């Protein structure tokens, strides 16, 4: 949100849930952020290097968190045959 | 829906319905009955 | 009634966890130890403290008492926690699986020594 001459006039731009695309407010305390370690050629983690995901409080409360992480992970190569689109 | 008509051609029912219920109000009831002139000792005057 | 208050219960507990090797079943011996190992304000309370410490000592001879632990006891415990049998119970002593369990192995593509047995409701 800019003013008439291209200056951002916003306190901060919040994150968004990866599973549902909603805003993670300042006090969404069910919300979490997972870090998944990348693996080097030899087969051992590369410190500080992550594939990061966010899930909102709503998603986790309904019980969909596990399922929606399977989908995101597979789309990023971190799983092979866990999630099927044609349920 | 809520308990009133909503059609484009429902104006008649919404007029009549409101007219009937206005009588539950005290100001409307006393004014149109004309109880000021009929019964009030001052007969609607501010002083006597 | 001869119930003992928390001041007595905890002072006695605090002495066993530090002085098991030096404590004994004798009341007269324990009574004299508690003069040199604690600062208590009265003969009456000292006698009660030493009395209940003796009482717990008899208990420990019969077995572990809940909520009191001391060096000698725990060291034996951890040794019993390092146990590991001669051979794993999971080892293939001869593995039996159902028809549906066999179908799973085929789907994954693994080679195993299956033996198939039937089942019913």
């Amino acid at each position: 949100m800019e003013n008439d001459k291209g200056q951002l006039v916003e306190l901060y731009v919040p994150r968004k849930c990866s599973a549902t695309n909603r805003i993670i407010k300042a006090d969404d305390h069910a919300s979490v952020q997972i870090n998944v370690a990348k693996v080097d050629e030899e087969g051992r983690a590369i410190p500080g290097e992550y594939v990061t995901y966010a899930l909102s409080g709503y998603v986790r409360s309904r019980g969909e968190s596990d399922d929606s992480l399977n989908r995101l992970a597979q789309n990023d190569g971190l799983l092979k045959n866990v999630w099927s689109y044609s349920r | 829906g809520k308990g009133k008509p909503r059609g484009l051609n429902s104006a008649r029912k919404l007029r009549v319905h409101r007219r009937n219920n206005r009588w539950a109000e005290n100001n409307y009831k006393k004014r149109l009955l004309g109880t000021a002139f009929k019964s009030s000792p001052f007969g609607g005057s501010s002083h006597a | 009634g001869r119930v003992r208050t928390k001041t007595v219960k905890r002072a006695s507990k605090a002495l066993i966890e530090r002085y098991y090797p030096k404590l004994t079943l004798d009341f007269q011996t324990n009574k004299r130890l508690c003069d040199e190992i604690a600062t208590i304000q009265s003969k009456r309370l000292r006698n009660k403290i030493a009395g209940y410490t003796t009482h717990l000592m008899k208990r420990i001879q019969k077995g572990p008492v809940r909520g009191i632990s001391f060096k000698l006891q725990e060291e034996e415990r951890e040794r019993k926690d390092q146990y590991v049998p001669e051979v794993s119970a999971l080892d293939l002593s001869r593995l039996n699986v159902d028809n549906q369990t066999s179908d799973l192995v085929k789907s994954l593509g693994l080679k195993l020594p299956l033996s198939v047995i039937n089942v019913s409701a």
Binding site: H29, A37, V39, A45 | - | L110
Partner: protein, 206 residues
């Protein structure tokens, strides 16, 4: 993407089939349906051990991302998992919670049990419900060993396994310990098995 050596080996498949990590519950809830393979007569539902393994490595990779090993907390209120937890923490650097879980460990900051981890692992979401509930107030991710009927709310990475058996719970904890150490390099080679028998994790109550 992971290399080809992370795939399921027949040696492992023997362990998973030997401890009956595949014999699940007679009733399955909707969220766990993907993990089912087929239905045996008598109602037992076989679990797809392939997804048990893949979910075990993925969980293992989240643990390895925590900078400090002490900020991983392992819980097991029920007995069949208490020995396992006390040994997961020993081999890795986790903080175990075996036995009673005092309400307010994660939300009350003047209690002697105060911990603020970056990840919690639990053995049974139905009996360790307090830890899951308290996690949701302070933004702590959760990993839970899950049966086909166990509840999944406020759980992020569920590892499907048969949790009604002594050997099954022990084995899953053992393999998380193994995979984590290999990732961190404490074990040099993935091809050679671990020198600690998995039965070190199993329960004993004579």
């Amino acid at each position: 993407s992971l290399p080809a050596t992370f795939d399921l080996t027949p040696e492992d498949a023997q362990l998973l089939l030997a401890a009956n990590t595949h014999l699940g519950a007679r009733n399955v809830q909707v969220h766990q349906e993907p993990y089912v393979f087929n239905a045996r007569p008598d109602g037992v539902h076989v679990i797809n051990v392939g997804k048990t393994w893949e979910k075990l490595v993925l969980a293992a990779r989240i643990i390895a991302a925590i900078p400090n090993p002490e900020d991983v907390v392992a819980i097991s209120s029920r007995t069949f998992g208490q020995r396992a937890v006390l040994k997961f923490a020993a081999h890795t650097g986790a903080t175990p919670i075996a036995g009673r879980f005092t309400p307010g460990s994660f939300t009350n900051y003047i209690t002697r049990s105060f911990k603020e981890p970056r990840l919690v692992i639990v053995t049974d979401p139905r009996s360790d419900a307090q830890a899951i509930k308290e996690a949701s107030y302070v933004n702590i991710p959760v990993i839970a060993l899950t049966d086909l009927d166990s509840p999944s709310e406020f759980v992020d990475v569920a590892i499907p396994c048969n949790n009604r058996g002594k050997h099954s719970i022990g084995l899953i904890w053992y393999l998380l310990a193994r995979e984590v150490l290999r990732l961190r390099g404490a074990l040099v080679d993935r091809t050679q098995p671990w020198s600690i028998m998995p039965d070190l994790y199993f329960y004993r109550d004579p």
